[PDB]
Symmetry: D2
Subunit: 420 residues, 4 copies
């Protein structure tokens, strides 16, 4: 146990009385509304989101990186930190690895995961940066590079990711690349996309029968003029071209200003190409901030579309959700904990929406009551539900407060030497 059980128990006991009061009060309010609080809690305690191994370390910008104390040394230190997030929130049982950053003997990775009670989610390839001893640079691209040798090298790396994933229990490969141009004319849009499609087709060949290949669109950065996989439209063309095993990943902060993101989610679902959603928040661009910290209502609206899919009876809809954030000014462990909480928060709220009433207001074009129907769900403070779900599953009523009480950061700070 990364966090002492007695600490968790002690902090839970200290907040038990208030939780009892808030939960029962909420339960009665929900009951008056025709909702069984126990049914919501039961689903909430089963909602999981993958944590990125690269998120437990402090992030930075091109201007600077301000590391905190006890930064994880390698993938093993990262898994140990991810274990804390899962133990306290019980909402992140799976970790998403990034190759070559997390490269290590698959058997050891698996053994560490099992010992910590962590599983492994989608593998993530890396052809947006150069590794040492690399025959060809990705400066001008990878899978869509003009040079065939460079594209084949990118393909082999991705195939390697699949091999590592197969050995640790992963069932998917996420592909996000920086491929694009910074100047008009630098790239022939169409030829670059044709090259990308051919490369991906190669990667697709290496997928096991029960694996998925996820392509992730991004409007810009690292490319500042054009990006090959720039939006969901190109993303759809990709998945539809590759085949049944290919789907699209929607990363919240990867869209143009004012984009109606929840609509994109609904569209991809309608055409069965929503592989998953990558959570984070933003105000300006791909800020990679804590989910829900900037626009909590938008996060709720995305979940409303995810829950409606279930309500409409969409078949075989098992999206792979993951958090993809960069924590530049907070303890990474604490930010991921509260971000996972916000994600469960919005999910619980989407579960509260009176779909019956909603359908009636949509049918009658009663816009005001339709929006108020969503608001009645969203305005509901579901924290007691999230808290109780944690208590029941061995987690903490107040994750961050328990984390701080355990003095975990100080402990790892003393165990881990800062880089020189």
């Amino acid at each position: 146990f990364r966090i002492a059980q007695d600490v968790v128990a002690r902090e839970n006991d200290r907040r038990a009385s208030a939780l009892k009061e808030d939960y029962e009060a909420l339960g009665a309010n929900l009951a008056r509304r025709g909702v069984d609080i126990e049914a919501v809690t039961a689903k909430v305690e089963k909602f999981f989101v993958a944590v990125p191994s690269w998120g437990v370390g402090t992030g930075g910008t091109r201007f600077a990186r301000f590391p905190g104390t006890g930064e994880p040394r390698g993938i093993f230190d990262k898994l140990d930190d991810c274990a804390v997030i899962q133990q306290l929130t019980r909402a992140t049982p799976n970790v998403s690895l990034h190759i070559p950053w997390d490269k290590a003997d698959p058997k050891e990775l698996k053994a560490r995961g099992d010992a910590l009670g962590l599983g492994f989610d989608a593998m993530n390839s890396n052809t947006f940066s150069d590794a040492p001893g690399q025959a060809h640079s990705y400066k001008y691209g990878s899978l869509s590079h003009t040079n065939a040798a460079t594209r084949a090298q990118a393909v082999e790396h991705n195939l390697e990711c699949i091999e590592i994933g197969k050995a640790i229990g992963s069932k998917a490969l996420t592909v996000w690349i920086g491929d694009g141009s910074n100047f008009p004319g630098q790239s022939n849009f169409t030829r670059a996309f044709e090259r990308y499609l051919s490369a991906m087709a190669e990667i697709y060949k290496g997928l096991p029968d029960d694996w998925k290949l996820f392509s992730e669109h991004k409007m810009y950065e690292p490319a500042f003029y054009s990006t090959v996989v720039q939006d969901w439209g190109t993303n759809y063309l990709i998945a539809q071209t590759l085949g049944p095993k290919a789907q699209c990943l929607v990363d919240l902060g990867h869209h143009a200003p004012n984009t109606n993101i929840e609509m994109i989610v609904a569209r991809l679902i309608q055409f069965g190409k929503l592989g998953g959603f990558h959570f984070n928040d933003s105000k300006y661009g791909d800020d990679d901030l804590d989910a829900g910290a900037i626009e909590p209502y938008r996060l709720f609206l995305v979940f409303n579309e995810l829950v409606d899919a279930e309500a409409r009876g969409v078949k075989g809809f098992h999206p792979a959700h993951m958090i993809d954030q960069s924590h530049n000014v907070t303890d990474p462990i604490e930010s991921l904990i509260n971000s996972a909480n916000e994600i469960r928060r919005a999910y619980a709220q989407a579960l509260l929406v009176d779909r019956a009433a909603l359908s009636g207001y949509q049918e009658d074009n009663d816009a005001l009551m339709a929006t108020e129907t969503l608001k009645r769900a969203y305005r509901t403070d579901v924290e007691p539900i999230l808290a109780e779900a944690r208590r029941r599953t061995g987690g903490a009523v107040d994750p961050v407060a328990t984390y701080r009480a355990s003095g975990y950061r100080a402990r790892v700070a003393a165990e881990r030497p800062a880089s020189v």
Copy 2:
């Protein structure tokens, strides 16, 4: 009473039991947080926001307008409908008039106002459209038009708005114009602004000493290349140049994409030039949608700055808040009702912020706990306080439900073409 008191009473009793349960539960939860729910309710029942006379009728776009039934025929019908908003929400006791749309015997206006239990907020001039018999067109601008005669006409119009305002009890004049250009080179940025400043100086000269002159910035529309009063920066220069009685109005949907609007509010407050906030919500441009319907957190963050100004003890801070929305696909009255409700919702939540805790987390640079401190307030469902505040002041526990149960829309539908 636009709405029968017996209907109000009925629709309140029907929900009183549930409200009592919710209010008490919240009272206990707030007590555990060291907050007296009674103190919050007392503040909420006193929070008012002006309603735009022109928002009570159905709005439309350049593509089309789809009026509903019982549309107001003029200012008097508009006041009648505004009276419904005030009676049920008790959060909009003052109406903001727009001239010449609402031109009418000032004495008559005041009469109906008093009768309906309404007052008049800031006056709104209109030099972004031409009126009947108007000598010069405002097609190429008004207060900053290249033609002197046009500018003088614009100035005179604003002065007339002041005269009408003084007669009905208004204490401020709001000036928003579309002045700008649609092509590069069309206007000379600096000269157009110089002309605007001089005209506003004339208007300012005709201001009573207990009056204020509000200028309102907008990034674009109707001008699609440049706008004289395009942002708060230009707006500040305007207020600073004109004088102590001149301040800046901040309309939520009037800023560039991703603008940090709450920061703009803070800046203006710090330099004492925040005349008021024009509430509404948006996703794309100046959508003029129901407040909080798109980004309720942003609305709360704006109120966080408003409430912090008080906690910081800022003096003389008494901003003139007003709703400025267009209701294209809903009953204007219901939208205004829920919007005014949302504005009080954000205010109440802001009142819940533990300032001491927040202050400590900011000084120590504990970003996570600092943001969590705001969320603890924001995540609180203050609806019970809003409903109770209304109930205690003669309003409806559920305004829209009561509005619909009264059949008011059907009634005016019969009385109007």
Copy 3:
């Protein structure tokens, strides 16, 4: 001759000398560049773009409309005005009609266009506004409205547009609706889209073998929260679903801030769904400003994709281009004239691009020389070519000057109601 031939001739001879100088100098410069100026001029004079019948009237905003003098009373006055643009620029041979605004006797329309030297392009349906006596309001939608009867009414209207078009020579129907929602929850995104697809399928069935059905995306307005056909992504799904005769229209001002519009053009072409491009310019949203008045380089880059498509030999690629603008502060005829010119300006510069050189820098990943290769074409002032092309084809060397010299505005102003 809507504009006296003596004026045109006079205004041309008055500038003919300077033009020969500029044209001969440019011809020399291009020659030093291995470019035959005559080849460029021959292509330019053949480039056309449809003009919107509703474009010759003064537009406005939700705040106000300031009409000028001599405002057209209807389609016939509009056609008389469109004839002016075509006579002087020789770049707008066809006019795009909008129903019910231009509803009239097909024979009348055709006879007039033939007499004015104008043809008829894509038809435009209108279910984003209510007409007198209309049985069902489009307030909450049309082709995607929740009410079956309302959708049927919208479908019937579109089919009626096809009938009108068949009688006047049109070969395409363009569908742009305001369908969407202003509030979260008001609409169920998927169900609305399904309804839309089903209605469009009914319209598709009524298409002649040689007709095309164009769907046009728009991020927002009149809908301020969500729009059924919000972007090219949804638009592609529509075109692919409907069939071979269904394609996508890209209107420049209809995208999110900072969107790379030229890429959307390349993507739709790659998959054979680029029905056409609707020209205009913008800085904030769907401003509908004169083409190239805000970002002429972007206009150029859009044409770079169009020209590259031809150069690569893309099969069956014949976009249905049209101008879609709102003129709120200028004489509508003059803006359309210069907009059409701005379009040909960008087209001509795109033609000057050394494709082999660009291709080489692209393969070598020489980003600097690649962008410079485009700039060498873009920086070139091709005004002489545009001017010469107009002169040789019966147009005006300086269109707007000739237009103002003819005193046409004052004329129609005296013949039309205030």
Copy 4:
């Protein structure tokens, strides 16, 4: 000379003929327009823009940095590369230094500059990153940090930049900081700004009589929720508050999407607070791309405002312009060369605007002709002027071509060790 004179001479001669043809053709067309080409060229050859010392090294993003060959290490390597840009374009005689990156003995800096034919422009402080051994971290801010000792350290560092600048001929300190917040509530907007203003007042006290203090606004990055000096409105408030010696810097890519930047430029000039403009181009955010590579017309429109002010010499108008870009996928030297060219290009075209005619169309509200008046100047291919200006001043007719013909990049690559072969 970084580049051999014989190479410059040879490459100029190779293009001399075509240039004469185009220049004469343009001078003729301009003559017919009532414009004397010589009057333009004369001003163009005198238009300079400072080059950032950090601009000659390959840039990167948070995801990666892909260095090219012969990367300059240290300020001396950088000045050597900046010297190339000046020799070939003659538009970048001064270099802007960044402390602590370019920290070195002033006497040696001055000497190396004089030797290369380079002068020194505005000094640039750095409190948006941490230096080794630094007492206080700038993680949560610098000049506006809640910790007093941290602000003091920030202030002392800026004062140190002023001292270095005084020793090498600089007359200004440019201050761009990352100070802001990533989460609502993290910072108290007003208090942070009050702390910032108080700290800047201290720096202001250390300014010589003939020095200027430039503050630079940026909408976001590194801060992703709020930034203390977020826009020109806040920036104006800073300058006005600080005093006559404080002005504002406008960096093209530091504004919200669709912002009308040329208007901001006009407003600052009107109120005498436009300290300078930092050139680069962008499409999505602060992309720091090559000037004019994305929106050349916007660049011209900014210069239309500058040229107008320049003609009618306005009180307080003496801009300290500088290029501030990141070259992630091109030879930094080549990009800076073509960027400086674009800057002069817009300047030249703005110089061709018929102000009398423009003023007329503006007074009559003839929007169509007003915009066309601007376009007639913008559409003019002024390359002949730019190239003739360079040729007359010891530069190269085609700068990049000459740079490539010289083999300079290959030359420095053999002199400077890369990280790997």
